[PDB]
Write a protein that binds this DNA or RNA. Structure first.
Ligand SMILES: [Cl-]
Ligand SMILES: [Cl-]
Ligand SMILES: [Mg+2]
Ligand SMILES: [Mg+2]
Ligand SMILES: [Mg+2]
Ligand SMILES: [Mg+2]
Ligand SMILES: [Mg+2]
Ligand SMILES: [Mg+2]
Ligand SMILES: [Mg+2]
Ligand SMILES: [Mg+2]
Ligand code: NA
Ligand code: NA
Ligand code: NA
Ligand code: NA
Ligand code: NA
Ligand code: NA
Lengths: 95, 154, 156, 186, 140
RNA sequence: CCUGUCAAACUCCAAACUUACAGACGCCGUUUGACGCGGGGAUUCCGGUGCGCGGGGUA
RNA sequence: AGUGCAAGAGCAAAAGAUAGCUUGACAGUGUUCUUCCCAACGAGGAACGCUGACGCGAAAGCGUGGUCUAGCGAACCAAUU
RNA sequence: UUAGGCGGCCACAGCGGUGGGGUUGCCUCCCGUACCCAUCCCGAACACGGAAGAUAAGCCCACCAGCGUUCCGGGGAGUACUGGAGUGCGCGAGCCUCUGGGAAACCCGGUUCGCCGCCACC
């Protein structure tokens, strides 16, 4: 990489297909999850807030409590345990 | 159910491919194992496709090889009809063979090593640089094809 | 400079003029020859087919084209036929003309990438294949071995 | 519409019916919504909750089914709105609903408006709702006084036949009074 | 069908596009209600570089205020045809524009469930000339 | 309308493939204690080649 | 289109424009991610909370500076609260 | 749902067009400014009050595929590309065989002129 910011090499993953462009539906931004539930992490290009570091796009963690309206999701980066603060707008129930 | 025989060595073979053969209980060249035809097992044999010989053997062939190269989980004991009768659910090698072929049981389930340690092929095999359709010995074989190999390694 | 230096397609496609400046103009004079007023309403259609993917410098295109069309004057300056070179030299080529330090070359020319089996030239003629000869001369000035192919023409 | 890349708005945005930016903010409370809606002739009030396949209305009241309790006057006015709010609010309480946030859709937050009258009604029914008292009408207007006085400048009945000639903010009290005890569907 | 298909005047905009005013006064008397400032966009050579800047006024008249005005405006104009909108409008003159349409226009001017007026229900140049011409004057 | 061509820093499309999690089978672990935790001791931070994918370069 | 400035991304009853009002560019203290994938490492940065005090709004709510990724600096010493 | 309100999925729903529908449950357009409220100017809008009229807009109902979109059949194509293997071929670029996957354009023919949820309601 020529630079090392968080958005380095995120051109694709943080861009919407032309038709999914525009304000996203509120339904999924208000979804509620319970501790223990498995959630897929995926930033929604249209939603600015409640995001997490782009490297974690694609992870599937375990909700383990929340902070404010955001959720605290536990994942394993490679071999390391990490906790991610993320809102519902960027989460999806597994299965 | 297919008969699996490793014909190519570990040196230079992909590690993930080597671990696959190891999960199928083969740890040496010329070692054979019997594998049920399932989706899970099918993918494994496809991955190992290039360093092995496999196919469905005939009732007879399996019996010859079972008698000749089958072993208890532990020890020298010959696996003959009596052994089979005094140790398994079946009454003789043929009965065990049929059950294996019809994928009703497994060598382990009947207290036998999952591996048939074969002998080199008398007369030599067709070569490990080309598949069957090219005259070599690698890949899927005919029941008649597997039988020849298995019998030459009896 | 020899074609040995640029005939291979081993390098990335390099054609974005928005990030490349100082590109030499092309030496190819025309792409439509003969009676361009008329449309392919001819009995016979012969094509010069490249048999190997290669890069053809605008240098070779011009000499190949000239040698073919300049000859198609066995039919006359205003003869009844139309000649078409369908490829354009899009690939920008460089040269490292310090040694291997900061070697990214400077633009020195352009070439067209042709894949084996494509037709680079297509002529349209009435039963009067002097064009077959115009091409024996054309594939003479381009790197690859070539196939002279005739399409509409069962008048053998 | 024009091509593959064209962006078509969500249906309710096309229909110009749902303001999604306001909706999200509304749903933030995690509380049920007191949906205040109007029509040229009527006024509707619903207590809506969120659902897996769309909203769920747990209680509602329409200005029309107001007559079902003794309403003999027009239904597109302030007194009408309040009562419809109170009616929905009461049904809401019966359904086990204790709190809600006011959703006025595409209407305007004008002081003394009908949507706020609806809000006043629902609150008096017992519903706990985030509000602001000095953005509501001054009771008298809610009663329908502004219309009675308007008929004082008579010369011609404000109501075509209907009921009364000088109208009745008293009819309002009788009704509110009614709604505050017993009766069916409450 | 008709009655709800017949044209009507919706606002008449009288505006004086000056270039920098004292003009409002006359607009107020010619119409009868306060004029509105006309700010301009973009910086340009006619020493008009100021973005927010009074550069003229306009007056939108509706109902009677519009008729009682046209009952003297029209007479001071001759023109017709070609000078008409594709939507049945026309501007003459100090400018005086007349926006014409049929009964269900509110549908496209309200907040809730607004909607664009169908081409069929739109007012054509011709259907416009008729209405007006049929009101104290002549076309072309 | 017709007709001739392209893109490492284009995309209406779009693989093979890589990858998070879960279940199943396999293999492995529960006297050979896996997975993991804490602590002692290093060596090492000139690498090279083949194959596949590369970027630079006439090579 | 615009949104201060590279490039890429986000945005339309708005994140843009206009008007009005306001000083949350607030004090205190944290959780987490980043810096440093995996995998230890400071300053710095960000996300998301809480406690206190406020602004605006009918209200839900928004405001932990600018739509997002650059705009940054240890110990010793001095000045300052 | 003989026309309503809040929505979920967010073009299979868009664009364009045809036909049908209202003494009333209704929605609208519509009529009108004393009030609450309102236009940097206008009761246009917003807000409020109301039914003389209308079904012409909207809306709801039925339908049309020309454009856009979704999915499917057949053709393109098991082509292009590709994970694994080879003392197969080729001066080389590169190609081929076996094994496991497998496209895009485009053409022709179908599909699509929304589906679903809660509440209310001759
Ligand atoms: Cl993070
Ligand atoms: Cl409404
Ligand atoms: Mg043993
Ligand atoms: Mg021998
Ligand atoms: Mg040999
Ligand atoms: Mg990769
Ligand atoms: Mg911000
Ligand atoms: Mg020092
Ligand atoms: Mg100082
Ligand atoms: Mg009609
Ligand atoms: Na979106
Ligand atoms: Na140098
Ligand atoms: Na040649
Ligand atoms: Na830090
Ligand atoms: Na002004
Ligand atoms: Na209608």
């Amino acid at each position: 990489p020529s630079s090392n910011g968080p958005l380095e090499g995120t051109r694709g993953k943080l861009k919407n297909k032309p038709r999914d462009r525009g304000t996203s539906p509120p339904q999924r931004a208000v979804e509620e999850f319970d501790d223990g539930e498995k959630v897929h992490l995926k930033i929604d290009p249209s939603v600015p807030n409640g995001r997490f570091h782009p490297r974690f796009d694609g992870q599937t963690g375990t909700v383990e409590g929340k902070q404010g309206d955001a959720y605290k999701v536990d994942i394993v980066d490679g071999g390391k345990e990490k906790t991610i603060i993320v809102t519902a707008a960027h989460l999806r129930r597994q299965e | 159910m297919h008969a699996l025989v490793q014909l190519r060595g570990e040196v230079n073979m992909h590690t993930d491919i080597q671990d696959t053969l190891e999960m199928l209980n083969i740890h040496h060249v010329n070692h054979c194992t019997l594998v049920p035809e399932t989706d899970a097992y099918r993918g494994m044999v496809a991955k190992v496709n290039d360093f092995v010989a496999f196919g469905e053997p005939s009732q007879e062939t399996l019996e010859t090889v079972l008698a000749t190269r089958a072993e208890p989980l532990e020890g020298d004991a010959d696996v003959d009809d009596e052994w089979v009768a005094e140790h398994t659910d079946y009454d003789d090698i043929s009965g065990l063979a049929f059950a294996l072929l019809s994928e009703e049981t497994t060598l382990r389930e009947q207290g036998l090593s999952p591996t048939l340690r074969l002998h080199p092929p008398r007369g030599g095999h067709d070569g490990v640089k080309h598949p069957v359709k090219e005259g070599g010995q690698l890949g899927k074989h005919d029941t008649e094809g597997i039988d020849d190999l298995l019998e030459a390694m009896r | 400079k020899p074609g040995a230096m640029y005939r291979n397609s081993s390098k990335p496609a390099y054609t974005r003029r928005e990030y490349i400046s100082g590109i030499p103009g092309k030496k190819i004079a025309q792409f439509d020859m003969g009676n361009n007023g008329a449309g392919p309403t001819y009995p016979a259609q012969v094509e010069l087919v490249v048999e190997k993917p290669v890069q053809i410098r605008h240098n070779a295109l011009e000499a190949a084209r000239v040698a073919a069309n300049r000859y198609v004057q066995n039919s006359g300056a205003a003869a009844n036929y139309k000649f078409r070179i369908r490829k354009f030299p899009f690939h920008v080529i460089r040269e490292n003309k310090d040694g291997m330090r900061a070697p990214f070359g400077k633009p020195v020319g352009t070439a067209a990438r042709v894949h084996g089996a494509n037709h680079i030239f297509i002529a349209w003629v009435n039963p009067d294949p002097n064009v077959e000869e115009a091409w024996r001369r054309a594939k003479m000035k381009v790197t690859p071995t070539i196939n002279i192919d005739s399409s509409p023409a069962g008048n053998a | 519409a024009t091509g593959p890349r064209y962006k078509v708005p969500m249906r309710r945005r096309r229909e110009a019916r749902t303001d999604y930016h306001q909706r999200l903010r509304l749903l933030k409370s995690g509380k049920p919504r007191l949906v205040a809606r109007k029509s040229n002739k009527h006024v509707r009030a619903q207590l809506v909750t969120l659902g897996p396949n769309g909203d769920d209305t747990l209680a509602s009241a329409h200005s029309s089914d107001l007559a079902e309790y003794g309403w003999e006057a027009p239904t597109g006015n302030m007194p009408s709105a309040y009562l419809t709010g109170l009616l929905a609010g009461l049904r809401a309480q019966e359904a086990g609903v204790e709190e809600a946030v006011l959703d006025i859709g595409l209407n305007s937050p004008t002081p003394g408006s009908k949507v706020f009258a609806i809000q006043e009604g629902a609150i008096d029914a017992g519903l706990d709702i985030p509000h602001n008292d000095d953005v509501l009408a001054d009771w008298q207007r809610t009663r329908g006084a502004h219309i009675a006085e308007y008929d004082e400048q008579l010369e011609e009945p404000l109501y075509s036949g209907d009921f009364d000639a000088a109208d009745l903010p008293e009819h309002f009290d009788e009704l509110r009074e009614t709604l505050l005890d017993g009766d069916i569907e409450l | 069908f008709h009655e709800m298909r017949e044209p009507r005047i919706e606002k008449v905009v009288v505006h004086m596009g000056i270039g920098h005013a004292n003009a409002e006064d006359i607009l107020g008397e010619i119409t009868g209600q306060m004029p509105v400032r006309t700010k301009a966009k973009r910086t340009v050579g006619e020493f008009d570089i100021r973005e927010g800047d009074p550069i003229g006024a306009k007056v939108t008249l509706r109902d009677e205020m519009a008729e009682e005005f046209l009952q003297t405006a029209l007479p001071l104009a001759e023109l017709a045809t070609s000078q008409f909108d594709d939507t049945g409008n026309f501007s003459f003159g100090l400018d005086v524009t007349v926006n014409l349409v049929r009964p269900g226009y509110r549908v496209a001017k309200r907040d809730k469930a607004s909607r664009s007026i169908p081409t069929k229900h739109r007012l054509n140049p011709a259907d416009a000339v008729a209405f007006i011409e049929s009101t104290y004057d002549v076309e072309v």
